[PDB]
A paper describes a structure:
Similar to β-CoV nsp1, α-CoV nsp1 has been identified as an important virulence factor that acts by inhibiting the host protein synthesis function. Here, we are the first to report a 1.8-Å full-length crystal structure for FIPV nsp1 and a 2.1-Å full-length crystal structure of SADS-CoV nsp1. The crystal structures of SADS-CoV nsp1 and FIPV nsp1 reveal that their monomers contain six antiparallel β-strands and two α-helices. The overall structure of α-CoVs nsp1 shared the same fold, with a characteristic six-stranded β-barrel formed by β1 relative to β6, β2 relative to β5, and β3 relative to β4.
As a newly discovered CoV, SADS-CoV broke out in 2017 in Guangdong Province, causing the death of approximately 25,000 piglets within a few months. The SADS-CoV nsp1 and FIPV nsp1 structures were refined to 2.1- and 1.8-Å resolutions, respectively. Their space groups are P212121 and C121, respectively. Each asymmetric unit of SADS-CoV nsp1 and the FIPV nap1 structures contained two and four subunits, respectively. With the exception of the regions encompassing amino acids 105 to 110 of SADS-CoV nsp1 and 106 to 110 of FIPV nsp1, all the residues of both nsp1 proteins can be built using the final models. Similarly, structure comparison showed that the overall structure of SADS-CoV nsp1 is conserved relative to that of PEDV nsp1 (with an RMSD of 0.84 Å), but it has several differences relative to TGEV nsp1 (with an RMSD of 1.89 Å). For SADS-CoV nsp1 and PEDV nsp1, the length of the β6 is significantly shorter in SADS-CoV nsp1. Additionally, there are also substantial differences in the loops, especially those located at residues 11 to 22 in SADS-CoV nsp1. Furthermore, the structures of α-CoV 1A nsp1s and α-CoV 1B nsp1s also exhibit obvious differences in some loops, especially those located at residues 52 to 59 in SADS-CoV nsp1. Specifically, SADS-CoV nsp1 and PEDV nsp1 have a wider distribution of negative charges on the surface than FIPV nsp1 and TGEV nsp1.
Residue numbers in the entry:
A (entry chain B), B (entry chain A): 3 to 67, 69 to 104
The structure:
């Protein structure tokens, strides 16, 4: 539930998603157990900073107002979408979040 | 891992989805445990049949070549997307699929 995430703090970041949903639950379960030390939070309003992730690529989406995390394409647009967790090594600032998995 | 699904066969498919991941999980979870009988399979390419479902609405998506099913917005477009299961009372024909979750 309580997570201190690495929020992207570069003007542009190099990132990547995954091609299929099965590669994503494979890859993101390791992240989820390692507190996402490898991912960066990108706010919905800052999506343009992300390079290397196509609309078809799977990332971790966050929705809510308390956030619910789930695997989704980067191009998907549900209401209440607040941001994504995206594999990246960008520079970051640590921020506390409340996340449901 | 071996499912009989109601494949939509009407000219127009009146249907609906769900506005948040949390709400979608609840319904589809009950729909899954009742064999998806309240749902219709809509092949990719026939989404213009569907009335009542917004791109932001959550439905069940099915991707693969053997399918894997997961909750996703109706508008999401991963590679190998084969179709959706969407709550609908449309006329149907029964067909055989292979599905994991």
């Amino acid at each position: 539930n309580q997570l201190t995430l690495a929020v992207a703090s570069d003007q542009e970041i190099s990132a990547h998603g995954y091609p299929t949903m099965s590669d994503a639950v494979e890859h993101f379960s390791s992240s989820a157990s390692h507190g996402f030390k490898d991912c960066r939070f990108v706010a919905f309003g800052l999506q343009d900073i992300v390079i290397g992730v196509e609309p078809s690529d799977f990332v971790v989406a966050l929705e809510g107002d308390i956030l619910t995390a789930y695997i989704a394409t980067f191009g998907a647009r549900p209401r209440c979408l607040r941001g994504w967790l995206i594999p990246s090594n960008s520079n970051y600032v640590l921020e506390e979040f409340q996340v449901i998995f």
